[PDB]
Design a protein around this ligand. Structure first.
Ligand SMILES: CC(C)(C)OC(=O)N[C@H]1CCCCC/C=C\[C@@H]2C[C@@]2(C(=O)NS(=O)(=O)C2CC2)NC(=O)[C@@H]2C[C@@H](OC(=O)n3cc4cccc(F)c4c3)CN2C1=O
Ligand SMILES: [Zn+2]
Length: 198
């Protein structure tokens, strides 16, 4: 009944993929209890750094990527949820269930990737475990893994970036194509789609 109706919590940043130095590695910035409390209140006072954030809801964890001052991620992970921030929950700035894309204003402290203009097809996918996976671009929104991996290896990496050799953002990881549980290809939201959305 109306009085007992629950509210979904915010998406909470719980870590980041560190790409600054010469070694890529995952960092956790908040443990599961803090995350649950932060999800409920929407108030997150933690310092944010970097381009690729690890994010969580009460029930899922995945990635979020800053491009042109927007923190982008997938609708199948974030739904229409707000994101926790120092001043309380922040409403989505973009929502597109047809592209499986959402965006909030990028948190203070984050760094944004620049949209690729190279027209290059040698890409790199960054996972939540900070693996940097070579991907050959195969079409507007697909790319093949040079070395196939079991699905398990990509799970929880949606929202992560595909980058060009110059470190520009080419797309946001959306879905994996598999045969017998082995991922051969990936689907992503092309950065131009984002630029249009904006
Ligand atoms: C499209 C095609 C060719 C049929 O393929 C597949 O549907 N395959 C599957 C294989 C699943 C096995 C795990 C693979 C692991 C990693 C996959 C990256 C990943 C993930 O890490 N999610 S998450 O854990 O972080 C999650 C916690 C955040 N995404 C998923 O699972 C998505 C979610 C779901 O699809 C969607 O809801 N929509 C909605 C869309 C709207 C428009 C366009 C789209 F494409 C859309 C895709 C199925 N997904 C796949 O990938
Ligand atoms: Zn580029």
């Amino acid at each position: 009944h109306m009085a007992s109706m629950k509210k979904k919590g915010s998406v909470v940043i719980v870590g980041r993929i560190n790409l600054s130095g010469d070694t890529a590695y995952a960092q956790q910035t908040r443990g599961e209890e803090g995350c649950q409390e932060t999800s409920q209140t929407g108030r997150d006072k933690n310092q944010v750094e970097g381009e690729v954030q690890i994010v969580s809801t009460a029930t899922q964890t995945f990635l979020a990527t800053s491009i042109n001052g927007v923190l982008w991620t997938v609708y199948h992970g974030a739904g229409t949820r707000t994101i926790a921030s120092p001043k309380g929950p922040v409403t989505q700035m973009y929502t597109n269930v047809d592209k499986d894309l959402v965006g909030w204003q990028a948190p203070q402290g984050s760094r944004s990737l620049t949209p690729c203009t190279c027209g290059s097809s040698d890409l790199y996918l960054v996972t939540r475990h900070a693996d940097v996976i070579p991907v050959r671009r195969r079409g507007d929104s697909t790319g093949s893994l040079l070395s196939p991996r079991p699905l398990s290896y990509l799970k929880g990496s949606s929202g992560g970036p595909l980058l060009c050799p110059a470190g520009h953002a080419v797309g946001i990881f959306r879905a994996a194509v598999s045969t017998r549980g082995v991922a051969k290809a990936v689907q992503f939201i092309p950065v131009e789609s984002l630029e249009t959305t904006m």
